[PDB]
Amino acid sequence: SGNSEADRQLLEAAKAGDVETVKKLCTVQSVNCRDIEGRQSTPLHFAAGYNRVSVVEYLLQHGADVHAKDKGGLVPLHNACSYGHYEVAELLVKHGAVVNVADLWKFTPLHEAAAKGKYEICKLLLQHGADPTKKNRDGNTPLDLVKDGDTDIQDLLRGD
């Protein structure tokens, strides 16, 4: 259908970072469409995971859903944190993303940012109340997932 090809091209443009094509194709129907043949990601999940800051900014200003979950329960903030994209993470939080959201495995954005060792994202999340003591379904807190070698991030999450 007209909508399906356009949804596909929008998802592709969001992944590619092509903001002019995103603007061209963004409709109420497409803006939060799901990638049915993949993991049910929205355009925002793609823009966030692939570090497409201008596209994130456009999407957020035209009603994209910061809280949308992919098939694993990931929200766009999870993709930003797991792939280490700070500006995207900041934008999402500024537009209401919940830093304590949990996926189906009970991993939060801080579990992801802690494992990845991204200081600025860990700081952003902690300043907005991310819990460094919250256990996922492995029994691991974000502090537990800090790589054993990564002393600087360990110190940051300890806080106190």
């Binding site: 995971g49 694993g72 797991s82």
Partner: peptide, 8 residues
Amino acid sequence: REAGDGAE
């Protein structure tokens, strides 16, 4: 647990 869509 498979990764979300994106790349480092």
